[PDB]
Amino acid sequence: LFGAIAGFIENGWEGLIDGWYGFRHQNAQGEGTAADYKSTQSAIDQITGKLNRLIEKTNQQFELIDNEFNEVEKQIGNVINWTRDSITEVWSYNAELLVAMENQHTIDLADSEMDKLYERVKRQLRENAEEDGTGCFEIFHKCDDDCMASIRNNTYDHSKYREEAMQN
Amino acid sequence: LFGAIAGFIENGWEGLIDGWYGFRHQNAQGEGTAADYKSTQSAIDQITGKLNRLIEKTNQQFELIDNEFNEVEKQIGNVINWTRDSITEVWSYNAELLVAMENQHTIDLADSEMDKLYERVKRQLRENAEEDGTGCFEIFHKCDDDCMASIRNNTYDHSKYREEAMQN
Amino acid sequence: LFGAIAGFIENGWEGLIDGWYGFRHQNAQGEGTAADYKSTQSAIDQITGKLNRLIEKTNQQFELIDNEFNEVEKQIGNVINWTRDSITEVWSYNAELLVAMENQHTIDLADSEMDKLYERVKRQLRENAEEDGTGCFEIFHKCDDDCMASIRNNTYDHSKYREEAMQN
Amino acid sequence: ICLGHHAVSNGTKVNTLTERGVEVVNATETVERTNIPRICSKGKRTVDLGQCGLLGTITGPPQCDQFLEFSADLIIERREGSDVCYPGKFVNEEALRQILRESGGIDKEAMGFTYSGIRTNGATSACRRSGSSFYAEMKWLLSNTDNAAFPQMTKSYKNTRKSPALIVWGIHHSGSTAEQTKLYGSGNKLVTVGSSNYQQSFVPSPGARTQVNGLSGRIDFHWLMLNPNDTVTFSFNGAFIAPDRASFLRGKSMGIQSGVQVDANCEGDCYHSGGTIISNLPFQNIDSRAVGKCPRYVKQRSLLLATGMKNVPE
Amino acid sequence: ICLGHHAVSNGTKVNTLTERGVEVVNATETVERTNIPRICSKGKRTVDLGQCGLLGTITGPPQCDQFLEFSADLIIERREGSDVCYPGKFVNEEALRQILRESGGIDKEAMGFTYSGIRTNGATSACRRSGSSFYAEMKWLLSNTDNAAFPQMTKSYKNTRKSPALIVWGIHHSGSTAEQTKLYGSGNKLVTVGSSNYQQSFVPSPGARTQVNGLSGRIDFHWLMLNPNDTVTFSFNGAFIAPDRASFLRGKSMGIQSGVQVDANCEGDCYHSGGTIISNLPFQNIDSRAVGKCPRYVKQRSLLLATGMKNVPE
Amino acid sequence: ICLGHHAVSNGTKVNTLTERGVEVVNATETVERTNIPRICSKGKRTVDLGQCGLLGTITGPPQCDQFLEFSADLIIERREGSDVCYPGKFVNEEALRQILRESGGIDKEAMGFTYSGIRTNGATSACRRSGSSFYAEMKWLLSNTDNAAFPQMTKSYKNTRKSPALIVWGIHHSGSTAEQTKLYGSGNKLVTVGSSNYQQSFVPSPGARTQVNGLSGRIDFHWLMLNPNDTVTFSFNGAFIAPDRASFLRGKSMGIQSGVQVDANCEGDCYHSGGTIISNLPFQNIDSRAVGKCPRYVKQRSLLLATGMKNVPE
Ligand SMILES: *[C@@H]1O[C@H](CO)[C@@H](O)[C@H](O)[C@H]1NC(C)=O
Ligand SMILES: *[C@@H]1O[C@H](CO)[C@@H](O)[C@H](O)[C@H]1NC(C)=O
Ligand SMILES: *[C@@H]1O[C@H](CO)[C@@H](O)[C@H](O)[C@H]1NC(C)=O
Ligand SMILES: *[C@@H]1O[C@H](CO)[C@@H](O)[C@H](O)[C@H]1NC(C)=O
Ligand SMILES: *[C@@H]1O[C@H](CO)[C@@H](O)[C@H](O)[C@H]1NC(C)=O
Ligand SMILES: *[C@@H]1O[C@H](CO)[C@@H](O)[C@H](O)[C@H]1NC(C)=O
Ligand SMILES: *[C@@H]1O[C@H](CO)[C@@H](O)[C@H](O)[C@H]1NC(C)=O
Ligand SMILES: *[C@@H]1O[C@H](CO)[C@@H](O)[C@H](O)[C@H]1NC(C)=O
Ligand SMILES: *[C@@H]1O[C@H](CO)[C@@H](O)[C@H](O)[C@H]1NC(C)=O
């Protein structure tokens, strides 16, 4: 729905076992991969809250209306079976539609979270970098490992390396 | 869902009693706050239409099937109570799911409207300003009060103060 | 929901009979209009899959519980009519809500697809063009017909006409 | 220039698909709880039965003398209402009640039963008018003298209307056998009813019951719906309470059971025993047995629907 | 270069969660309204009962002589069908109809009842074959001569199959008492039926009824389901119409009531009285009492589902 | 610096509104299929009726001598349970079963019926204790000697409690008429029951039935609910099995039918014949007739709910 996951980003990282979303960087020092905690925790909190909303015990008690050992009269029995079958159709429909809708909103929700993380990182880097289109921000200045960590910790200053990267 | 409200914008304006969304500006003349009419009216129209869709009278008439003064026979009475309880469970489920879904789509709808207003203002300001990341557009030219009003009235010209603000 | 269709884009193209979305260009060679195949095919695949999900036969068989030629006894008949009317209310509600929700998600889905196509074209054109705000990318270099086709085929190189278009 | 949204100091918590307690700017209720403690009947032909029972309007005990041919869009049963003056009961009682609630009223028409060599006006002190009387629409068939016998008779009535006719007859179960011989003579009696859709049968059972209204005897009431151009036949030889007039349904109506007063100042289409549910909301938590045009009953006391954005204060 | 979407000059208005009448490019119907005015029975073993009533197939009036051992996947009841030739009625009628509709047909088997000192072949002009006849599967038990008496007999039948046996017997209610004494002798008769799940009771009631088919007498029909290795017992002493053969259910089938002709050219699994609902849509607005494998009935005539984007023309 | 999401090598396919088989990172089941093959009754007062039938607890056959005044939150009926020792049956059987399942147990109280010039202790070999006995809560009313007659009696019982009293009486249908004259004398008997909400009627029917337990006679059992400060009246003259004690409902309970053993180690609130459904899921595919506090039954075997993003591997 939001275009990030599955998605202008090619695929996911099987090596990213630390969280749902994260940053993977290549620089002059080497290559690294860390997990973004706030986005992952947000998606986990929303989806977990959804599951807790669906997981609920029915405190409504129903009593036995048929008899399995001595069958009730045929007419009232056919009315009972007819009603129970109607209710079964209603609840099967409700369950199918519920699961389908919740799955749709779940996938689109995670996609939205990824898009929000990417957009935030774009907010941090104003003219010091140019987005590529596959989920990467091409830097135009020597972003040290402390600079990358400042990007991950939402502390990167835009005016620190601005003019250094504008002319590139 | 869309990231604007609640949200890279810190919080709402309790002083903004003129509408749902709006602009608050600081310049060389002073500080001001006005309400955006089209976005507010759009969200109000959609949510109001939703409420009018839910507020509907059931023109289906149901008759009395029990008897409160002289109780009906126990067997057919237990079938009646069983059916009515099943229907009650179905409608309680439908009401809960309906309200939850409608609330979700409502909140995400307002968030979407805010994001659309912000994106429109970004369309108006092409290179004459740079977004900060908290819902502000940092201007690089002396935007007069008539310039701010031109931004609010969707009449701001991008090429009028372009080169004046590009070199900053 | 996503702001693209209906929408910062003024209206649709009745002459675009080749697909759902597409590009219409004016250059130094002339004017042209082509359809974007991947976005159109994606929206058609999702909506078609939705229709195939709703189009389903009920393999649950129900038997006759009333009698149209010799009316059953009045009490059990009133219980039967009462139950059938309740089920009818439930299914009328389910059908109304289902169609309304599916229509909402359909319209917002197409809007999302348009926004994703526009965003992709923005990814291709990095500083070689500036978006106008009505769905157009104002070029700052002489984009030949092969350049336009390279934009449509997702093969346009950003660094080929970069500096040629940066100074404009 | 900066962009933002509005907020309030005290929002309203609602529930979504993911959370429980999201504070929004504004919200509105979807489950109705407000009840009007009276029967809103503005613009409706209303009949408050009061002390008259709904089934009594077909037989006519003294408390139903003013309801023998009522006409209404709304019928109100009361707890003090009684169907009988002489102790008795109806067979298929609730089905007949449901037939009469949506009948739109009843129209009586004489059936024209003529008898010979028999007593046709039995009375009792339990059905008191000027003195000892009986059901206004019925005829207690006794014997000529203090004993004698009961000649076996066969009466027939053809419904000459285009609407089905409600036929109601009675069978007396005296307090003992000697009373049954005093009223109808010695021997075992029978009452047979015939037509094209009905087939019975019947036979009395004398015996001592409880002293309701001071009497130990009972009276069974039975009924059937006679189709147009069809004939009902009563072949009997004792313990018979014949119908004097048959009933026809006027049209359509609404039937409720209530204990609150009637109010012609307010209008309503959803009723329960405690009053009227005037609401536009799709759900209600007042009464699951509410009848008429009602919002669907739900177990939840409240379900708040968000009508504004999320409230994010500083 | 500019980007945009397509549009049409005449879209289709649909309804969403927020609006009512949003014009989209394309939409499709979800509520079926098209009806096929015939019973589509392609590839199904069909039995059109016609003038034969469904219950008659167990007793066998002249109009059911060709349906005594039918076999079908689909059973069709007609308005002109009749269960009886001699005036009468079934007890627990609709329950037996519902048992027979999904039975897959019936299989008859002789019960082997032998009598002595009695008349076993009573006939009537209302059941006409070559002359005065009777139900093919029943035996009208009368008396040896024009009066005489009725010796009290006790017959028993043990269902020697693995499937329950449908047992149907009759009790004659003559037009008067003198006729009952002419057919079965004087005195009060009785018919008792016993087994491991059933307990009755029965007793006649002679009297004048309406002249259906020119006759004032009636015949009650009663039935029970005899479990395997269980025995049914009839201890009677007059007014008895004994079963000659018992019925067994063949398998499974579908039962409908219709007034339209049968068509083996079209296939269908959803039927009503007016025809067949051939559709893939999830809902239908044709008949709420449709039976089989049907879309769910809804009150809405139409519910348009959007299959395209919103139509925004210039 | 590049941004991305996580993925796995083996995801879980789920279904959405648009597709069928979208592989996501993680998913969980919403339809319960796991069954506990025993009755989880931890912390509940449980009564396993075993060989005693639920209705027998009111009449008291030998197999119900230890259940005459039970008290429970959960009542378990077994297939081997029997309501009777002498062959017979209850009228309105299932309604009484449903009354007793949620009764919370029963409390017996003597009704104080005194008789004169009659036999009050009839016995049979089918109800064996020390020797030939009878129902513990009933009294088989016979005659003084091997024939004689049956004086017509009228007994009355006023429910002096604040709770309705369960009244159960019996009517004997002997194997023939000569047996009925041996037990109660010659003539046609009757049993009439009266109060303020009930009106019957009854009459025996002697005849040869099947030899259940070696006996060809049957016993009808009838019941009613006597309201507080109301009186039940029995006017009879033969073939009567009078109630010795009346029953009162203790409170509330749960009634199930099962064939699996009881387990006090596990707790459960959803039961079926095959065991207990312990689950927090909103749906179940185990048994549509499950009773108690259960998830809603659905036809689908499985419905996987996505708990993670879409799995997009390389
Ligand atoms: C209702 O369905 C059950 C199967 O779950 C079946 O055993 C029973 O016989 C049906 N009821 C009647 C009256 O046939
Ligand atoms: C049905 O429920 C009502 C409570 O609303 C109760 O008063 C009534 O007794 C129940 N029906 C039967 C047959 O117990
Ligand atoms: C149930 O509704 C039908 C109309 O579809 C009507 O013909 C029938 O009489 C109703 N049932 C009773 C018992 O009135
Ligand atoms: C808030 O909702 C209520 C619900 O009826 C409405 O009456 C009121 O006008 C609304 N107020 C605002 C400010 O939206
Ligand atoms: C009923 O009978 C009258 C005359 O006896 C006749 O005019 C009318 O058409 C008949 N209607 C029906 C439905 O049989
Ligand atoms: C429009 O929808 C109908 C619905 O069946 C379909 O048959 C038709 O092919 C669709 N046309 C287009 C252009 O999508
Ligand atoms: C029924 O009886 C036959 C022989 O009498 C026996 O073979 C069969 O197993 C029995 N079946 C049942 C279900 O009792
Ligand atoms: C996956 O879902 C199951 C469902 O219960 C849960 O137990 C498990 O912890 C989840 N694992 C991850 C990695 O989310
Ligand atoms: C029942 O009667 C007793 C005394 O006979 C009296 O105290 C009590 O109030 C009465 N209760 C009712 C409900 O009539």
Coordinates of C-alpha atoms in Angstrom, one line a residue, chain C residues 4-6 9-17 19-26 47 50-51 54-70 72-73 84 87-89 91-104 106-107 110-111 114 117-118 121 125 134-139 148 151-152, chain E residues 1-9 14-19 22-25 28-31 77-80 89 93-94 97-98 101-102 253-259 268-269 272-274 279-283 287-300 302-314:
Chain C
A4 CA -2.6 11.4 -5.8
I5 CA -5.9 10.6 -7.5
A6 CA -8.8 13.0 -6.9
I9 CA -3.9 15.6 -10.2
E10 CA -6.8 17.5 -11.7
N11 CA -8.6 14.7 -13.5
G12 CA -8.2 11.6 -15.6
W13 CA -7.5 11.1 -19.3
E14 CA -10.4 9.8 -21.3
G15 CA -8.0 9.3 -24.2
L16 CA -5.9 6.9 -22.1
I17 CA -7.6 3.8 -23.3
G19 CA -4.4 1.3 -19.3
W20 CA -5.2 2.7 -15.9
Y21 CA -2.2 4.9 -15.4
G22 CA 0.3 6.4 -18.0
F23 CA 2.6 9.1 -19.1
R24 CA 1.7 12.1 -21.3
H25 CA 4.7 14.1 -22.5
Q26 CA 5.4 17.3 -24.4
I47 CA -8.9 -5.8 -7.5
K50 CA -10.6 -9.3 -4.4
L51 CA -13.5 -10.0 -6.8
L54 CA -16.0 -12.4 -3.0
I55 CA -17.3 -14.6 -5.8
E56 CA -17.7 -17.9 -4.0
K57 CA -20.4 -20.6 -4.0
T58 CA -21.9 -21.6 -0.6
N59 CA -21.4 -25.4 -0.5
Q60 CA -23.7 -25.4 2.7
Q61 CA -27.1 -26.9 1.8
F62 CA -30.2 -25.8 3.6
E63 CA -33.5 -27.7 3.6
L64 CA -37.1 -26.6 3.5
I65 CA -38.3 -25.7 7.0
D66 CA -41.7 -24.1 6.1
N67 CA -44.5 -25.3 3.8
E68 CA -45.9 -23.1 1.0
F69 CA -48.9 -25.3 0.2
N70 CA -50.1 -26.3 3.7
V72 CA -47.3 -25.2 9.4
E73 CA -48.7 -24.6 12.9
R84 CA -35.3 -16.2 9.3
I87 CA -30.8 -13.9 9.8
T88 CA -31.9 -11.7 7.0
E89 CA -31.1 -8.6 9.0
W91 CA -26.9 -10.8 6.2
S92 CA -28.2 -7.5 4.9
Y93 CA -25.9 -5.7 7.4
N94 CA -23.0 -7.9 6.5
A95 CA -23.5 -7.3 2.7
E96 CA -23.8 -3.5 3.1
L97 CA -20.8 -3.2 5.3
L98 CA -18.8 -5.6 3.1
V99 CA -19.5 -3.7 -0.1
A100 CA -18.8 -0.3 1.5
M101 CA -15.5 -1.4 3.1
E102 CA -14.3 -3.1 -0.1
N103 CA -15.2 -0.1 -2.2
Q104 CA -13.3 2.2 0.2
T106 CA -10.5 -0.3 -3.7
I107 CA -10.5 3.4 -4.3
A110 CA -5.9 2.7 -6.9
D111 CA -4.9 6.1 -5.4
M114 CA -0.9 6.1 -8.7
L117 CA 4.1 5.3 -9.9
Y118 CA 4.6 9.0 -9.4
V121 CA 9.3 8.4 -11.5
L125 CA 14.7 11.9 -11.8
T134 CA -0.1 18.6 -10.7
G135 CA 1.6 15.3 -11.6
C136 CA 4.3 16.7 -13.9
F137 CA 8.1 16.6 -13.7
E138 CA 9.5 19.8 -15.3
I139 CA 12.6 18.8 -17.1
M148 CA 11.2 9.8 -22.4
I151 CA 11.9 7.2 -18.2
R152 CA 8.9 5.0 -19.1
Chain E
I1 CA 6.7 14.7 -18.5
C2 CA 3.3 14.4 -16.8
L3 CA 1.7 11.4 -15.1
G4 CA -2.0 10.7 -14.8
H5 CA -4.8 8.1 -14.7
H6 CA -7.6 7.1 -17.0
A7 CA -11.3 8.1 -16.9
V8 CA -14.6 7.5 -18.6
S9 CA -17.5 9.7 -19.6
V14 CA -21.1 3.0 -5.7
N15 CA -21.3 3.4 -1.9
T16 CA -18.3 3.5 0.5
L17 CA -17.8 3.9 4.3
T18 CA -17.9 7.7 4.0
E19 CA -20.0 8.6 1.0
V22 CA -19.0 7.9 -5.6
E23 CA -18.6 7.5 -9.4
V24 CA -16.0 4.9 -10.3
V25 CA -14.7 3.6 -13.6
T28 CA -20.1 -5.2 -10.8
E29 CA -23.2 -6.5 -9.0
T30 CA -23.1 -8.6 -5.9
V31 CA -26.8 -9.2 -5.3
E77 CA -44.0 -31.3 -4.5
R78 CA -46.8 -29.8 -6.6
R79 CA -49.8 -27.8 -5.4
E80 CA -52.2 -30.3 -7.1
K89 CA -55.0 -36.3 7.6
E93 CA -47.5 -34.2 9.0
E94 CA -44.7 -31.7 8.3
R97 CA -42.7 -34.5 4.9
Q98 CA -39.3 -33.3 6.0
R101 CA -37.8 -35.0 1.3
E102 CA -34.2 -35.9 2.2
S253 CA -32.1 -36.2 -1.6
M254 CA -33.4 -32.7 -1.9
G255 CA -37.0 -31.7 -1.5
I256 CA -38.7 -28.6 -3.0
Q257 CA -42.1 -27.1 -3.6
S258 CA -42.5 -25.6 -7.0
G259 CA -45.1 -24.7 -9.7
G268 CA -28.8 -25.7 -10.5
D269 CA -28.4 -26.2 -6.8
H272 CA -37.5 -21.9 -4.9
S273 CA -41.1 -22.2 -5.9
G274 CA -40.6 -19.8 -8.9
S279 CA -25.5 -17.5 -9.8
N280 CA -22.0 -17.1 -8.4
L281 CA -22.7 -14.0 -6.5
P282 CA -22.6 -14.2 -2.6
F283 CA -26.1 -12.6 -2.2
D287 CA -36.5 -15.5 -2.4
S288 CA -35.7 -15.6 1.3
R289 CA -37.1 -19.2 1.5
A290 CA -34.8 -20.5 -1.3
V291 CA -33.4 -23.9 -0.5
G292 CA -30.3 -25.9 -1.5
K293 CA -26.9 -24.3 -2.0
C294 CA -27.9 -20.7 -2.3
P295 CA -26.4 -17.2 -1.9
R296 CA -27.5 -15.5 1.3
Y297 CA -30.7 -13.6 1.0
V298 CA -30.5 -9.9 1.5
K299 CA -33.1 -7.1 1.6
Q300 CA -31.1 -4.8 -0.8
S302 CA -28.5 -4.1 -5.5
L303 CA -25.1 -3.6 -4.0
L304 CA -22.5 -2.4 -6.5
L305 CA -18.9 -3.4 -5.9
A306 CA -16.2 -1.1 -7.3
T307 CA -13.8 -2.8 -9.7
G308 CA -11.9 0.3 -10.7
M309 CA -10.6 3.7 -9.6
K310 CA -12.7 6.8 -8.9
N311 CA -13.9 8.4 -12.2
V312 CA -12.7 12.0 -12.2
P313 CA -13.6 13.7 -15.5
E314 CA -12.9 17.2 -16.7

